[PDB]
């Protein structure tokens, strides 16, 4: 086929604006994962 | 046929004034087109 332009100018050709979606925005956070961190002396490991 | 005159005189023939339209006037400006201009040093081009 042929390219579909966006934000058409002053005459002639037609255009399709880029897909607009904002009410669908959401944040993905686990909020249930639990992990622990610490320091210590171990026999084998990278210092 | 025959010519249609405008702004008839003092007697006889009829006339039709030129088409008058002013409330239909509008200005066509894109207001969405964005273009950039600049200067630089390029390998090939007209100086």
């Amino acid at each position: 086929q042929y390219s579909i332009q966006q934000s058409l100018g002053n005459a002639s050709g037609v255009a399709v604006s880029p897909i607009n979606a904002d009410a669908t925005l959401s944040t993905g956070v686990a909020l249930n994962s639990s992990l622990w961190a610490g320091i210590g002396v171990f026999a084998r490991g990278k210092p």
Side-chain angles (χ1 to χ4, degrees), chain A residues 24-38:
Chain A
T24 59
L25 180 68
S26 62
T27 60
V29 179
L31 277 186
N32 48 6
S33 63
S34 65
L35 285 87
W36 59 275

Side-chain angles (χ1 to χ4, degrees), chain A residues 4-11 13-18:
Chain A
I4 299 167
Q5 59 167 300
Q6 305 163 341
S7 77
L8 75 165
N10 211 9
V14 291
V16 166
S17 306

